Amino acid sequence: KNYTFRCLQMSSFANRSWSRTDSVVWLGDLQTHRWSNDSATISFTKPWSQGKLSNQQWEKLQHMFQVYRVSFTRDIQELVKMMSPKEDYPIEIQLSAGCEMYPGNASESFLHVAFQGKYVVRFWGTSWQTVPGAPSWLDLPIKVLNADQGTSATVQMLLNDTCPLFVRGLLEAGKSDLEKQEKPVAWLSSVPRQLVCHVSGFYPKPVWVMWMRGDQEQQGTHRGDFLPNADETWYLQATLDVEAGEEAGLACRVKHSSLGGQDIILYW
Amino acid sequence: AAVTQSPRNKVAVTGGKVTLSCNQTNNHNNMYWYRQDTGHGLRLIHYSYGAGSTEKGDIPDGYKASRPSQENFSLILELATPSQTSVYFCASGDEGYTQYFGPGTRLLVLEDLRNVTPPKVSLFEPSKAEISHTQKATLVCLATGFYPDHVELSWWVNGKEVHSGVCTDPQPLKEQPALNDSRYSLSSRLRVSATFWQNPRNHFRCQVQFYGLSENDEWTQDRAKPVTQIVSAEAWGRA
Amino acid sequence: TQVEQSPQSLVVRQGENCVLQCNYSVTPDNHLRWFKQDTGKGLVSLTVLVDQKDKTSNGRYSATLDKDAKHSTLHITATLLDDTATYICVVGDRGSALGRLHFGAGTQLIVIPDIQNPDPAVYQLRDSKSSDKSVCLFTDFDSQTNVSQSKDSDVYITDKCVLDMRSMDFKSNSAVAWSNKDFACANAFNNSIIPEDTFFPS
Amino acid sequence: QKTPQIQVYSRHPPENGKPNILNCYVTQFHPPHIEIQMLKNGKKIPKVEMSDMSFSKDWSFYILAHTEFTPTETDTYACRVKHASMAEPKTVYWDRDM
Ligand SMILES: CCCCCCCCCCCCCCCCCCCCCCCCCC(=O)N[C@@H](CO[C@H]1O[C@H](COC(=O)Nc2ccncc2)[C@H](O)[C@H](O)[C@H]1O)[C@H](O)[C@H](O)CCCCCCCCCCCCCC
Ligand SMILES: *[C@@H]1O[C@H](CO[C@H]2O[C@@H](C)[C@@H](O)[C@@H](O)[C@@H]2O)[C@@H](O[C@@H]2O[C@H](CO)[C@@H](O)[C@H](O)[C@H]2NC(C)=O)[C@H](O)[C@H]1NC(C)=O
Ligand SMILES: *[C@@H]1O[C@H](CO)[C@@H](O[C@@H]2O[C@H](CO)[C@@H](O)[C@H](O)[C@H]2NC(C)=O)[C@H](O)[C@H]1NC(C)=O
Ligand SMILES: *[C@@H]1O[C@H](CO)[C@@H](O)[C@H](O)[C@H]1NC(C)=O
């Protein structure tokens, strides 16, 4: 299982003065940190969210972000000034940073930046560069950000070393939570005729759900999207199109790792 | 990578328009205006990221900025006030952190121009006693009767400026301290070797650049209009 | 004000070394720069320090910066008369043009010049355009002598000032006194502690 | 802009009289400013918890609202959303069967 660590930052600038920045952090599909605009410090959303970092290492790392957040806010504002009247508020910046962990001690880090909902910029190698499709005016911002050698060297440290190291630490510390198995519960219902198999409360995400006459997998089964529950489990429904009257005979089979080979079967 | 400011010195009345200019030929996108007041660091007034753009700094009130082109950033004072008396610095830069500073511009904003007066300049010739006692010759220059205290005194020998062997009073003295609008006086020295002074082909000139009124300022009195002007005194070396 | 310099001002004899402190609260602190400013003049850069713990030198100037302490110093070795200036500490909050600079108010230095061979005299100098007007020049005293102002407001006496004949490597102090409204050169500096061996020519 | 997708669903299988938790999942929207309300019989329910906002790989925002409820035969439950991408506020109703 390849685990992706994600730092998601979203920043809104309404006008020249007003601004908020909120962040959430994910390891796979589990939230590990929240950092809202209102809060001076980064919140742990899991007991093991500090990973294997000492207190001193964490304090020094948080402090770096604390400065980054304030600095980022102003730099966007000065960039908007530098570009105007080409670009103007409201503005939405999103960042997606982190690493993907692989078997052995291999990994891969990324830092992607979105402007008004379009991916435009990334950190790659030693510098910022625009990705294909990006407007040319971004070349001024990029040139300016690349002048800052201090920021460059730090971001290279974060992506090349801090991320992988830290996530290895997170994977050890949070193993119990990551490997948890929660059993799904299912129930049935119809609607105008369409049949619905409700599966909810399962962890982890991979699940098998099919409509069945006896043991002939109905080809017509349509899976919905995976919808989350608050308690960090999943919900999913499979719908089957039918002619009224022919419901009797149909059953719902549900396979999931938590069931330990004891598939849930639910006849109508 | 050089930057210039004009004027370098300006005496102005309240309610007047003053324009401070900066020219920079380095193709730098960015220009900045500061003022320096004794007991503070430089403070940012306005700045510009390029042609047509100007931005407020930390102390923008009373000033308006104008960036007509890549090379000109200009600080406009629409209605001048005494509180704007200061020394103004212009700077430029590209994407990097370095700002390259201009040489400065002194502004004095007076309530009234009624006392402005150009100086008299006298040059005093080296003493024969000094020459014989030291083998050195000291000329003295005296600028007197001027108001306000905005004068640059400089020494020229055969049409070239000399700094070696020169010293000038750090500030002028009041001729009448029991009065609020006393005229000022200032002295300076140039010491050369006696044999340099003894040379009748060396031409010595003390020069004072006085800063006062402009051709555009109104003048309501009878004495000549105390315009920005040069007043000077000169002597030839003698044996 | 997030940038504080110390001392406010200091007075030093030529040849002596001195040290200037800068302490700041600027965040972040990408770099610190030291400027020199002669009275009536612009800002000349002496050095710029950029590393977490940094040291640099430029001739008789050297400097350290310690970012954890948010503290820098400027060492001037073997001070010369031309070192007389205000010294300004500047911290930049970015490694690019997006940054603001935060200026200290400066430290004022005065270097007292070393007069090798004193010879205090008082001379009379004549005006070129007219032999009737004249000034009275007190020169070549050492830096131990103070020039006190005149008792009479008819008379004008300037404060001492030091000139350097660079080519001859020669420094000398001087003061000038005058007054049109009977006045003469023995009378001129009566209110000052002029040395005992002062030359008063005929 | 993206117009919000709203999806209402219950945590446990629905039984009249039996306390439960009801979810409103709001997705696919840009920009991030949103007002999400959970309504009982048209009236705003008070103790409504919100997940932190987040976004997918495609940069679109999502958020989960949930609240304690008790499904009865009579009571109707809904999730009402206001967002700039919409002239009118959009209300999706809880249907136990759907
Ligand atoms: C990144 C992976 C995460 C690592 C694992 C840790 C997990 C912790 C979980 C908490 C998650 C917290 C929320 C995550 C949010 C995602 C953020 C992604 C981080 C990548 C950015 C780090 C930049 C750090 C360097 C910095 O603070 N630079 C500042 C401040 O830098 C100043 O201070 C800097 C840092 O100070 C230090 O160096 N301190 C230091 C202390 C001790 N020893 C050495 C140094 C440095 O001096 C630098 O030279 C100076 O300029 C500068 O102002 C930058 O410009 C800020 C913006 C950078 C983002 C650019 C995005 C591009 C947008 C394009 C927009 C298009 C324009 C539209 C108009
Ligand atoms: C850190 O690693 C990069 C290698 O490239 C990495 O870039 C990161 C942003 C991240 O996305 C990561 O997954 C990705 O693989 C080094 O860059 C190389 O540096 C050399 C010499 O400095 C250049 O010649 C190469 O072009 C450059 N590689 C690429 C692919 O651009 C970087 O030097 C290293 N830095 C540190 C401080 O360890
Ligand atoms: C998001 O947080 C920032 C930083 O905490 C807020 O900016 C501050 O706003 C307060 C008033 O709330 C001011 O006194 C400070 O000068 C600001 N500090 C900084 C460092 O910028 C900002 O207002 C918050 N945004 C929202 C929408 O609440
Ligand atoms: C900026 O936008 C916010 C949010 O839309 C608004 O409440 C505020 O009035 C605006 N502020 C200014 C100074 O225009």
Domain end marker among B82, B111, B140: B111
β-sheet with A127-130: strand ranges across: A43-44, A30-35, A19-27, A3-13, A91-101, A107-115, A118-124, A127-130
Q: Is A208 in the pocket of ligand 4 (CB under 6 A)?
A: no
Rounded Cα distance between A72 and A93, Å, is 10
Q: What is the CATH number of domain C114-202?
A: 2.60.40.10
Chain breaks in chain B following residues, C–N > 2.5 Å: none
Tally of domains within chain B: 2
Site of tokens 């400097």: C63
Amino acid residing at A236: L
D66 interface with A at CB cutoff 8 Å: yes
Distance from CA of D42 to the nearest CA of A (A): 23
User: Would the CB atoms of A147 and B49 count as touching at under 8 Å?
Assistant: no
Rounded Cα distance between B99 and B47, Å, is 12
Percentages helix, strand, coil for chain D (3-state, rounded to 5) are 0, 50, 50
Rounded Cα distance between A128 and A145, Å, is 7
Q: Same structural domain for residues B165 and B213?
A: yes
Q: Could you state, in order of their start, the residue ranges of all structural domains in chain C? A: 1-113, 114-202
Rounded Cα distance between C73 and C79, Å, is 16
Q: What is the CATH number of the domain that holds B73?
A: 2.60.40.10
Q: Which of residues 112-171 of C touch B (CB under 8 A)?
A: 119, 121, 123-129, 133-135, 137, 139-140, 153, 156, 158-159, 161-168
Annotated binding site of A: 75, 148-151
Residue D66 backbone dihedrals phi, psi, to 5 degrees: -150, 155
Rounded Cα distance between A10 and A72, Å, is 12
> Is A144 within 8 Å of C98 (Cβ atoms)?
yes
Residue A75 CA, ligand 2 centroid: distance in Å: 24
Pocket perturbation via mutation, ligand 2, pick of A156, A162, A167 by most ligand atoms within 8 A of CB: A156
Query: Which DSSP symbol is given to A203?
Result: B
Rounded Cα distance between B10 and B77, Å, is 12
Amino acid residing at B20: L
Range of the domain at B218: 112-239
Nearest to B147 by CA among B115, B175, B176, B170: B115
The residue nearest atom 21 of ligand 1, judged by CA position, is A155
In CATH, what is the architecture of C1-113?
Answer: Sandwich (2.60)
Cross-strand pairs, B234 = B205
Cross-strand pairs, B7 = none
Q: Same structural domain for residues B48 and B84?
A: yes
Within 10 A of D51 (CB to CB), how many other CB atoms are there?
16
CA distances for C40 relative to B86, B103, B104, angstroms: 12, 9, 8
Q: Same structural domain for residues B82 and B163?
A: no
Method of determination is: X-ray
Q: Quick one: how many helices (H) and strands (E) in chain C?
A: 1, 16
Beta strands, E only, chain B: 3-6, 9-13, 18-24, 30-36, 43-48, 55-56, 64-66, 72-77, 86-93, 100-101, 105-110, 120-125, 136-146, 151-157, 160-162, 166-168, 173-174, 184-193, 203-210, 229-236
| SS3 of residue C168 by DSSP | helix
Residue in chain B nearest A142 by alpha carbon: B95
Please state whether the peptide bond connecting residue B148 to the residue before it is cis, i.e. omega within 30 degrees of 0: yes
Domain end marker among B59, B86, B111: B111
Which site among D23, D54, D57, D61 would you substitute to test the A interface, given the most A Cβ atoms closer than 10 Å to its Cβ? D54
Q: Same structural domain for residues B106 and B193?
A: no
User: Would the CB atoms of B234 and C128 count as touching at under 8 Å?
Assistant: yes
Rounded Cα distance between C111 and C44, Å, is 18
Residue in chain A nearest C93 by alpha carbon: A71
Kindly list the residues from chain C whose CB atom is less than 8 angstroms away from the CB atom of residue A75: 94, 98
Rounded Cα distance between B124 and B140, Å, is 5
Q: Same structural domain for residues B9 and B73?
A: yes
Residue A68 CA, ligand 3 centroid: distance in Å: 14
Rounded Cα distance between C93 and C104, Å, is 14
Fold agreement (C1-113, C114-202): yes
Site of tokens 């990551």: A178
The HSE-up count of residue C129 (CA atoms within 13 Å, CB side) is 10
> Is A126 within 8 Å of A156 (Cβ atoms)?
yes
Q: Which two tokens stand for residue B77?
A: 């004072």
| SS3 of residue C49 by DSSP | strand
Of A12, A196, A201, nearest to D98 by CB-CB distance is A196
Q: Which two tokens stand for residue A250?
A: 């149909």
Nearest to B233 by CA among B175, B148, B163, B154: B154
> Is B123 within 8 Å of B235 (Cβ atoms)?
yes
> Is B67 within 8 Å of B51 (Cβ atoms)?
yes
DSSP per residue, A164-177: HHHHHHHHHHTHHH
> Is A188 within 8 Å of A197 (Cβ atoms)?
yes
Q: Same structural domain for residues B106 and B142?
A: no
In sequence order, which residues have a C-beta less than 8 Å from that of residue B73 and are 6 or more positions away? Answer: B21, B22, B24, B31, B32, B33, B48, B65, B66, B67, B90, B92
Q: Same structural domain for residues B74 and B181?
A: no
Domains identified in chain D and CATH numbers? 1-98 (2.60.40.10)
Q: What is the separation of C-alpha A242 from the centre of its chain, rounded to a whole number of angstroms?
A: 37
Write out the H or E segment, with its range, that includes residue B195: helix B194-197
Q: Is A127 in the pocket of ligand 2 (CB under 6 A)?
A: no
Amino acid residing at B191: R
Ligand nearest to the CA of A169: 1
Query: Which DSSP symbol is given to A73?
Result: H
Beta strands, E only, C18-159: 18-24, 31-37, 44-49, 53-58, 61-66, 71-76, 85-92, 101-103, 107-112, 121-127, 134-139, 156-157
Site of tokens 């700077």: B91
Please state whether the peptide bond connecting residue D19 to the residue before it is cis, i.e. omega within 30 degrees of 0: no
> Is B77 within 8 Å of B18 (Cβ atoms)?
yes
Nearest to B63 by CA among B71, B51, B9, B48: B48
Q: Same structural domain for residues B126 and B220?
A: yes
Q: Is C95 in the pocket of ligand 1 (CB under 6 A)?
A: yes
CA distances for A86 relative to A12, B51, D81, angstroms: 18, 13, 33
PDB resolution in Å: 2.8
Q: Is A158 in the pocket of ligand 1 (CB under 6 A)?
A: yes
Chain breaks in chain D following residues, C–N > 2.5 Å: none
Residue A154 backbone dihedrals phi, psi, to 5 degrees: -65, -50
Within 10 A of A16 (CB to CB), how many other CB atoms are there?
12
Nearest to A126 by CA among A100, A161, A103, A151: A151
- Ligand 4: atom nearest CA of A17 is 13
- Chains touching chain B through at least 3 C-beta pairs below 8 angstroms are A, C
Rounded Cα distance between A96 and A156, Å, is 15
C29 interface with B at CB cutoff 8 Å: no
Q: Same structural domain for residues B117 and B102?
A: no
Nearest to C30 by CA among C95, C88, C97: C95
Q: Same structural domain for residues B118 and B64?
A: no
Domains identified in chain A and CATH numbers? 1-179 (3.30.500.10), 180-268 (2.60.40.10)
Task: Give chain B's radius of gyration (CA, Å).
Answer: 21
Residue in chain C nearest A71 by alpha carbon: C28
> Is D30 within 8 Å of D60 (Cβ atoms)?
yes
Kindly list the residues from chain A whose CB atom is less than 8 angstroms away from the CB atom of residue B49: 81-82
> Is B93 within 8 Å of B30 (Cβ atoms)?
yes
Q: Same structural domain for residues B106 and B116?
A: no
